[PDB]
């Protein structure tokens, strides 16, 4: 009586694990080369279905991470190698001793000062201390002037050049220099070869979205209770393409996120305690960074005929520094409250036991926030900021770190290890002129780690890759498979 028959055109699907197409609006380089134009269609429809969603175990987020990284690698690949520059450089001794690259025992320094010196210093748009790049506590940049002999395309002819390095970019040979001209090399040359990131990478924003190929579709959670891992999502929204993603790579605080909503959300890894905390846009949190001084850039033709961008500054500017604006105190209070009330949190009772904290260790890639402003990477020591936003009783943090400020000192570094799991060291060309960037702050990257009902430790993290799971994350890719089978009586003849 009941035969299988074939039902074609059936509204059903299964998990897909395939590549997606990218589409963009910025078509200056990589866009025209690799991506479809953005169609402008951001519409979506809802279904009365239940589906399982997981931000960490996703194919959509996995492609975002690997694709951003891969387009970086294919952009740098053809640029000039700097191994011809790994020669002894002759550096000003007072500068290498002053900033700790080399040693001297003839400085016999001794300081007597007031110990009751902690101050509170607030800055905002309407202030001359910002316009003139001089706020209480800001020091000089720490740039070291070094000379070296470099050969261009004439081969049997060479010239000496003036290159000023940031102090963190040099190693410097130590011991028995009783004169001048210390002997220095680039910090990461010898274990590897440094390549210059010549094709304007990071000088502008990279934004793109993913589109499903024919036969595939994207499902998204449209709940408010989505916490990264949700086995039964009741509000499932269907679309053909994802929202636009901002491929921003910064540690501690994520900038310019697309998921900027009037709500604090905390995604949680299902199997771990690593989380991405969005911030409530209601408070207009913003970070305005400046790199003081007017730079000169001097292209140098080296051996192969490719050009390297040198930095003959011949000056002594103030430190790069950053100013935090918006209602930071209140945005942080909401984060602490959101954690206390969260489904996966079984820790403390009060927000007076919940604190933001730096990761420990002596490793600069975690102890300092890294922010990319138009091509120059800016590591920033944030103790002043944290003391202020948390309104901490500092007291015993040692005299330079005991201040409460809404700005922090920072220091430019040109040889940066790639953010992805590569380990490659690249050189960032300097930008000419002065630099200013004004970013929104949309997320906090941190682990939540408590072992008792007192002290929660929101520990800032440097895994930049976790940020891509806030940009997407709520998407699932599915295959439409419209063939069904079901018992029925209607067989042919």
């Amino acid at each position: 009586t009941l035969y299988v028959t074939v039902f074609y055109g059936v509204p059903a699907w299964r998990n897909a694990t395939i590549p997606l197409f990218c589409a963009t609006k910025n078509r200056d380089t990589w866009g025209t080369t690799q991506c479809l134009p953005d169609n402008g269609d951001y519409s979506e429809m809802a279904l009365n279905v239940t589906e399982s969603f997981d931000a960490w175990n996703n194919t959509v987020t996995e492609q975002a991470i690997e694709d951003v990284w891969q387009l970086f690698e294919t952009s740098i690949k053809p640029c000039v190698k700097l191994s011809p520059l790994c020669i002894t450089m002759r550096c000003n001794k007072s500068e290498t001793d002053r900033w700790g690259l080399t040693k001297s025992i003839t400085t016999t320094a001794s300081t007597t000062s007031t110990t009751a010196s902690a101050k509170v210093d607030m800055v905002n748009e309407t202030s001359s201390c910002i316009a003139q790049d001089n706020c209480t506590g800001l020091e000089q940049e720490q740039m070291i002037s070094c000379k070296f002999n470099m050969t261009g395309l004439k081969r049997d002819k060479s010239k000496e050049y003036n290159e000023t390095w940031y102090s963190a970019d040099l190693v410097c040979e130590q011991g028995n220099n009783t004169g001048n001209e210390s002997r220095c090399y680039m910090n990461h040359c010898n274990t590897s070869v440094i390549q210059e990131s010549c094709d304007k990478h990071y000088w502008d924003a990279i934004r793109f979205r993913y589109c499903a190929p024919p036969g595939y579709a994207l499902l998204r959670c449209n709940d408010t209770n989505y916490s990264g891992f949700m086995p039964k999502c009741s509000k499932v929204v269907v679309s053909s393409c994802t929202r636009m993603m901002e491929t921003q790579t910064s540690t501690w605080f994520g900038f310019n996120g697309t998921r900027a909503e009037n709500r604090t959300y905390i995604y949680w890894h299902g199997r771990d305690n690593r989380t991405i905390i969005s911030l409530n846009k209601y408070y207009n949190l913003t970070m305005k960074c400046r790199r003081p001084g007017n730079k000169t850039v001097l292209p140098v033709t080296i051996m192969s005929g490719l050009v390297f961008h040198s930095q003959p500054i011949n000056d002594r500017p103030k430190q790069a520094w950053c100013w935090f604006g918006g209602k930071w105190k209140d945005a942080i209070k909401e984060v602490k409250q959101t954690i206390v009330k969260h489904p996966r949190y079984t820790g403390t009772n009060n927000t007076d036991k919940i604190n933001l904290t730096a990761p420990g260790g002596g490793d600069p890639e975690v102890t300092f926030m890294w922010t990319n402003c138009r091509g120059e990477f800016l590591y920033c020591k944030m103790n002043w900021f944290l003391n202020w936003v948390e309104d901490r009783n500092t007291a015993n943090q040692k005299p330079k770190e005991q201040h409460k400020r809404n700005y922090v000192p920072c220091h430019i570094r040109q040889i940066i290890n790639t953010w992805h799991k590569v380990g490659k060291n690249v050189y960032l060309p300097p930008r000419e002129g002065d630099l200013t960037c004004n970013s929104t702050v949309t997320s906090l990257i941190a682990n939540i780690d408590w072992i008792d009902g007192n002290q929660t430790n929101i520990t800032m993290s440097a895994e930049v890759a976790e940020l891509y799971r806030l940009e997407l994350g709520d998407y699932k890719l599915v295959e439409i498979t419209p063939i069904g089978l079901a018992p029925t009586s209607c067989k042919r003849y």
Epitope: Y226, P231, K232, S234, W268, G270, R344
Partner: antibody, heavy 132, light 106 residues
């Protein structure tokens, strides 16, 4: 903790109301639901509805979709039912519960199907008869 | 909805014996099944939750396990005080409760 209350006898086509007080705690406490079930004499248990303490959101048994309403009042530490269009089959013991979630590594959202949820705390129960 | 049923509907044994109740579902429940113990004249109380954990305050003689469409409640040694109606609750969606089973005392 949970003390219910209301008329023992109501009439057909009227609206029944039941109000439960929370003692030693409030109705605004985080991550709890104030729920009601019914137990008609001689029958098992039936869930009828749920109001979430941290929001104005409710969840009702579809069989009473147009008949049941739940609200809370933080100034009284009380929550209550209204059941309209009463009939003979609505005779039941009405009970309250807190439905505490098990917060932790097994709770992802305070939703049915996404968090262990159980009625650890129960009230006394009010028997309501619908009659002329 | 999920239809939750129970068996035996009525069972008994002596004080000191081994007693079990089985709950079944028409749909799988991942683990979201609760057990309640209701004695006549009283509100039900939680006995076991999330198909595996004993509710604090409940004697250690009570235990259970289960997954999918089959779950079990066990009393390792029946007490004279355990006569009660035991109910299963699924809360995978819009909780419905099963019919309940009775344990009497012999």
């Amino acid at each position: 903790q949970l003390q219910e209350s209301g008329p023992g006898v109501v009439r057909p086509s009227q609206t029944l109301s039941l109000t439960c007080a929370v003692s030693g705690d409030t109705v605004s406490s985080c991550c709890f639901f104030w729920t009601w079930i019914r137990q008609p004499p001689g029958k098992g248990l039936e869930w009828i509805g749920n109001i979430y303490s941290d929001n104005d959101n409710t969840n009702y048994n579809p069989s009473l979709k147009t008949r049941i309403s739940i609200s809370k009042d933080m100034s009284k530490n009380q929550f209550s039912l209204k059941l309209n269009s009463l009939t003979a089959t609505d005779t039941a013991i009405y009970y309250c519960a807190r439905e505490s979630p098990s917060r932790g590594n097994f709770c992802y959202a305070y939703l049915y199907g996404n968090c262990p949820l159980h009625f650890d705390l129960w009230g006394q129960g009010v028997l309501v008869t619908v009659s002329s | 909805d999920i239809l939750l049923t129970q068996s035996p509907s009525s069972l008994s044994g002596s004080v000191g014996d081994r007693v079990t109740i089985t709950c079944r579902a028409s749909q799988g429940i991942n683990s979201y099944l609760n057990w309640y113990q209701q004695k006549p004249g009283k509100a039900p109380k939680l006995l076991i939750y999330f198909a595996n954990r004993l509710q604090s305050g409940v004697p250690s003689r009570f235990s259970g396990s289960g997954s999918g469409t089959e779950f079990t409640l066990t009393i390792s040694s029946l007490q004279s005080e355990d006569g009660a109606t035991y109910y299963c609750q699924q809360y995978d969606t819009f909780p419905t409760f099963g019919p309940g089973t009775k344990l009497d005392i012999k």
